[PDB]
Amino acid sequence: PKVCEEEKKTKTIDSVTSAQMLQGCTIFKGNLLINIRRGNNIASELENFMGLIEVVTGYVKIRHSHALVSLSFLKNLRLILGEEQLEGNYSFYVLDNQNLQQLWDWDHRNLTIKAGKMYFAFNPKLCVSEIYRMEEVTGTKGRQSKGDINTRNNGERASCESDVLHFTSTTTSKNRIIITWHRYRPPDYRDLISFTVYYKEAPFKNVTEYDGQSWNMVDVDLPPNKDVEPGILLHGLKPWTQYAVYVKAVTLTMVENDHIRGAKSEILYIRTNAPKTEAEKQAEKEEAEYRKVFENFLHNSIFVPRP
Amino acid sequence: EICGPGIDIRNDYQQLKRLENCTVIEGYLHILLISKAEDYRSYRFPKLTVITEYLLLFRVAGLESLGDLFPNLTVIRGWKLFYNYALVIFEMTNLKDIGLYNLRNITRGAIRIEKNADLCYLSTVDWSLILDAVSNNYIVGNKPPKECGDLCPGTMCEKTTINNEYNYRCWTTNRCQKMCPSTCGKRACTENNECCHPECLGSCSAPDNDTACVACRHYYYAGVCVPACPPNTYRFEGWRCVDRDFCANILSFVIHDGECMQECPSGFIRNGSQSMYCIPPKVCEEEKKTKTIDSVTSAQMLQGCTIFKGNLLINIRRGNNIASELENFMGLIEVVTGYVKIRHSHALVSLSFLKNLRLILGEEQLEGNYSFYVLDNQNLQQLWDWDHRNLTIKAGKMYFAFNPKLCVSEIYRMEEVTGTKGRQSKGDINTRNNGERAS
Amino acid sequence: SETLCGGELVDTLQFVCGDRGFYFSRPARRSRGIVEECCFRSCDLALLETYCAT
Ligand SMILES: *[C@@H]1O[C@H](CO)[C@@H](O)[C@H](O)[C@H]1NC(C)=O
Ligand SMILES: *[C@@H]1O[C@H](CO)[C@@H](O)[C@H](O)[C@H]1NC(C)=O
Ligand SMILES: *[C@@H]1O[C@H](CO)[C@@H](O)[C@H](O)[C@H]1NC(C)=O
Ligand SMILES: *[C@@H]1O[C@H](CO)[C@@H](O)[C@H](O)[C@H]1NC(C)=O
């Protein structure tokens, strides 16, 4: 137990070095105004300087903080009182976070927003399945309208649909692993640019994809023996250690963004027995689109129906 | 020996006999979908010398080089393009070498050569002698370079440099690419390097003589190349002048401004059956309900329009000068009805090519009533020279999101030019997704 | 069948047409491209047979 009361009511947080006053404390007897526009490594260090904060006697506001993909650096936060709250009675507020992918991990993080409601806008990747589950889980389901949690701008960019890539086979080894998944194809296979596989050490089965960005990424395409199942060998492993591994398909984006779902596996936990360039990242997406559109134009031009 | 109209050849090699007499194809040529691999070099065509539009080949099986079939193909003019291309060679399952050993200029447009899994000798061609705007050439998917095995005379072909690759340049294992000595300056030249006439293209039969030009730099008339159309004669499409009576005798045309046009421009009317002249609103419209603009060929359908009474979708991913060429095809459009939509159009830095636009009538709004809608466009730093425009959106409302370079002052300035004042919400014109990477 | 767009589309058109081959005659005006049928909306082998010569 250790309190964190402060001479400012609104402890704005613009940097890791601004959180220093909080390092080793729990109850922040005030309100917060997070404004972390840029930085790196910050999550591994905020989880030290404020990853024990447990209760906030007021509102939380989160503004322009494009530097962070998740709030899970608030590892311990169990409760927001809302004893001080914003205009419109918002006591949790998440605005214009250009890159916010998820809130806390709703598979085991409990929470409560006791005395107020919440607002979400313009967070473009934080799709509604992450926040309706917050209305459900954090004691606030009935408190606010769906203009406060708007449908249109929030989550527009993010690919929150999820065809599943079933693992067809797996193969442990003394220092290696090999895994395979079925012949997934979108409705028009040229949308599929490649697969990407994520793996990391995970001694406990509570891990999530949105760890700090921490995962290791490897890529593989659909094989040229198109009859055979996708698969990969990973050599970066060690004795007896347990790894999480999961696969995400990387796909084009078009006017079909409303229909190019992409795909994600479940996380599969496997224990061993006892690079790209960031330019080609986009350039091959352009190359495949600017090929696909010409090939469509060619087929529209070449063929005409018989009498 | 001037064949025409544009030829499409498909299904079987026996169709190629329709080329026996062609010296010039006044149109396109397609040679595509010859699945059968039935025959080889019994078919060869010494005559074919110029193609006025593009050449398209697709899925022609059993063809091993194109220079067995079309020798002497000195020029492709490209007067109309396929997509942006005067030459296309796509998924030619067996094409080894491009051939065309005597090809010496491509006038309009780029070339696209891709998926040709076995194609080599694309490195060894110095396109800068044959084409300009070579920045458009797209030669990506062919045989990987280490597998290519490109070697030729000397390795007796001249060395050349492009992109600091100073090396020999050649079309095939048997024969070089050769180009004129700078003694000719701009002008063409013979074999054994005699310099050709000024009004000559590709090659000539003899130096500096009217009758010797095998292909022509501007217009051919009466067996001789000339710089300009003679009086009492009229340009036909692309490359020749013709008699007025000929211009009246072709049937499935009107002389205007000295051209034998297919139709008289907007604001001019054909005075009956006339063909010797035409005298001072081409309301063009649906095939699909909308039109979508991926390419310069997509715009060619509008070249005479000036009211476009259908919905417009702009979609232009990439091209190095189409930011200008579209001023010809689209710049004369004065009213668009329906809606205007613009997305993924990463090639555009501006709308200024729509130089004459004045109304967006809102006749057939988007879902949500949007009559103007601008999404996901990279670049597009500026819409218009607003200081003198009028552009009123008669009905329906504007939308703007994900315009990373468009400063919102230019959008809020639209409401002083446009209307759309009491007709908006801040969910439509947000201060957040626009201009965050502006300068 | 469901939807076809790339090499699959030309391959199944060749398969269904076989030796009869493909029709062409330049229009000029058009309904919609073969992709807007067989790729985006719904393909039918009774329609793919109508682009063949017969
Ligand atoms: C998972 O469990 C371990 C042990 O309880 C713990 O150290 C870790 O913080 C938990 N959460 C994550 C995301 O690893
Ligand atoms: C070529 O010209 C000759 C002489 O006019 C004619 O008999 C023959 O049918 C022509 N062939 C073609 C393919 O046009
Ligand atoms: C091709 O011919 C045109 C017209 O004669 C000329 O402008 C062009 O420069 C020639 N080729 C190249 C590569 O410049
Ligand atoms: C929007 O358009 C629909 C028809 O597309 C029309 O009926 C309606 O009145 C318009 N205005 C709205 C929805 O506010």
Numbering used by the authors:
A (entry chain B): 299 to 511, 518 to 578, 673 to 705
B (entry chain A): 1 to 155, 161 to 257, 266 to 293, 299 to 457
C (entry chain I): 5 to 32, 37 to 62
Q: Could you share sentences copied from the article?
A:
The human type 1 insulin-like growth factor receptor (IGF-1R) is a disulfide-linked homodimeric member of the receptor tyrosine kinase family (Ullrich et al., 1986, Lemmon and Schlessinger, 2010) that signals into Ras/ERK or PI3K/Akt pathways in response to activation by the insulin-like growth factors I and II (IGF-I and IGF-II) (Adams et al., 2000, Denley et al., 2005, Riedemann and Macaulay, 2006, Laviola et al., 2007, Tao et al., 2007). IGF-1R signaling is involved in normal human growth and development (Denley et al., 2005) and in maintenance of neuroplasticity (Dyer et al., 2016). Despite these advances, there is currently no three-dimensional (3D) structure of IGF-II bound to IGF-1R or to IR-A. To begin to address this shortcoming, we present here single-particle cryo-EM structures of IGF-II bound to the intact ectodomain of IGF-1R.
The head regions of open- and closed-leg structures are effectively identical in structure; hence, the description of the head region that follows will be limited to that seen in the open-leg structure, as its associated map (MapHO) is of higher resolution than that of the closed-leg structure (MapHC). The salient features of the head region of IGF-II.IGF-1Rzip are as follows.(1) A single IGF-II molecule is seen bound within the head region, interacting with receptor domains L1, L2, αCT′, and FnIII-1′. IGF-II binding results further in a repositioning and reconfiguring of the αCT′ segment on the surface of domain L1, with the αCT′ segment threading through the polypeptide loop formed by the IGF-II C domain (residues 33–40) and the growth factor helical core. In particular, the segment of the C domain of IGF-II that is most distal to growth factor core (namely, IGF-II residues 33–36) is disordered, as are the adjacent receptor CR domain residues 258–265. The IGF-II C domain is four residues shorter than that of IGF-I and lacks an aromatic counterpart to IGF-I Tyr31; the IGF-II C domain thus appears too short to form intimate contact with the receptor CR domain. However, the C domain of IGF-II has an arginine at position 40 (threonine in IGF-I) that is stabilized both by (i) a salt bridge with IGF-II residue Glu45 that lies near the N terminus of the first helix of the IGF-II A domain, and by (ii) a polar interaction with the side chain of the adjacent IGF-II residue Ser39.
